[PDB]
Design a protein around this ligand. Sequence first.
Ligand SMILES: CCCCCCCCCCCC(=O)OC[C@H](COP(=O)(O)OCC[N+](C)(C)C)OC(=O)CCCCCCCCCCC
Lengths: 11, 10, 242
Amino acid sequence: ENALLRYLLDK
Amino acid sequence: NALLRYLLDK
Amino acid sequence: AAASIPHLILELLKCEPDEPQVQAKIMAYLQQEQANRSKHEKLSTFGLMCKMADQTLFSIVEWARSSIFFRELKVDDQMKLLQNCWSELLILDHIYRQVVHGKEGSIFLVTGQQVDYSIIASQAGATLNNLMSHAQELVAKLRSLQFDQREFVCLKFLVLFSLDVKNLENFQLVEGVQEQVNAALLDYTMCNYPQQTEKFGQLLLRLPEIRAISMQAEEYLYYKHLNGDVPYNNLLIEMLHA
Ligand SMILES: CCCCCCCCCCCC(=O)OC[C@H](COP(=O)(O)OCC[N+](C)(C)C)OC(=O)CCCCCCCCCCC
């Protein structure tokens, strides 16, 4: 799991 | 809270 | 005689942010922010303070997540704890800054700026004036109690590690921190301030006052936001919207 990509998808 | 999650999990 | 510091407290102190580095980083950021703006789009004092507070919150999150004990919780637990206390930590930070760095009739900012009460008395509205008035009352109280850095860091941990938040998974770690930090704080006050027989209790009674002021601050900010006064992409607003 990559925190940055998760954020970009979820924001 | 996406930003909070990110600041912590990164 | 000699001062005594519980080992635990030494461990907490080690987690403290590098104050001069934070100050320089935040000031440089705000100066660059304003310089990047043309004459007509310059931030107001309020706009700058909103960005300042945002940067301070960023610093608070980085303090927590690098902190002993907290960094061992799952992210979901970390989020629940910070969602609960983010504004209390901002307030405690501000209050303590005044206790250590503040001078009569002025307020000291994270950037090292100093703001004369009179400047506020004139340009601030009643809402902010009321807020600052309550904050100043707590500052006077804490100065009177000889609130110090060791007690400050214990209170930060006690505010962060709240047992009053719903659906905490690792509640045993949270119980552990509450139990041991309370104990170390009590030992510290008894040993080092023995003439103030109820210092421990007196310090704890400041916590609901910190909560009250933090709620008032949240309310003021939310109102400013509803009026369209808060600059875009504010992390404080995201914490509010949660
Ligand atoms: C309380 C501790 C935090 C830091 C206090 C800083 C004092 C700054 C005073 C500067 C000089 C001054 O007087 O600035 C005045 C400005 C504006 O004032 P106004 O009343 O909103 O509008 C003016 C009155 N009108 C609208 C009726 C015309 O105020 C500020 O920029 C205060 C910024 C507050 C902190 C940023 C948000 C923090 C939210 C925290 C919630 C978790």
